[PDB]
Amino acid sequence: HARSTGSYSLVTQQPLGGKAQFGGQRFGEMEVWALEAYGAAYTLQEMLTVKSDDVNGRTKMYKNIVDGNHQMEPGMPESFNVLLKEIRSLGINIELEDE
């Protein structure tokens, strides 16, 4: 089984799972730890944000690859926004302080 791009989950905006659904392989916590041990920060960042969750990042990266430019925009994963909204729904105010 292989996948370049396809359908995404309607809640977390992540690629589906399983060969039947034409999903992508899951990069688990152990793989993240291995990447951190290797020190490949850029690979981990691109695999965490511009490949799975960042919708604008995904579209921009696809356009750049089609255009022949190998550059990315980290953006902001949608799962973190979902988590923030869920925690806010719990009565706890959590926000990102720019300062």
Partner DNA sequence: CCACCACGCGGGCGGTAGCGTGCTTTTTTCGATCTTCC
Partner DNA sequence: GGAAGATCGAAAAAAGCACGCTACCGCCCGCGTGGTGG
What does each C-alpha distance from 86 to 35, 81, 90 come to in angstroms? 29, 9, 7
26 binds DNA (CB under 7 A): yes
Residue 21 as a binder of another protein (CB under 8 A): the answer is no
* Of residues 38-57, those binding DNA (CB under 7 A): none
Among 20, 47, 59, 60, binds another protein (CB under 8 A): 47
**Using CB distances below 5 to 8 A depending on partner kind, what does residue 37 bind out of DNA, RNA, another protein, none?**
another protein
Return the amino acid letter for 22.
Answer: F
Q: Which of 25, 56, 59, 69 binds DNA (CB under 7 A)?
A: 25
Long-range pairs for 45-52: beta carbons < 8 A, 24 or more residues apart? 45/74, 46/72, 48/77, 49/74, 49/75, 49/76, 49/77, 50/74, 50/75, 52/14, 52/15, 52/24, 52/77
The site that binds DNA (CB under 7 A) totals a number of residues, namely: 11
* Site residues (vs DNA, CB under 7 A): 1, 17-20, 23, 25-26, 28-30
Q: Which parts of this chain interact with RNA (CB under 7 A)?
A: 6-7, 9-10, 16-17, 20-22
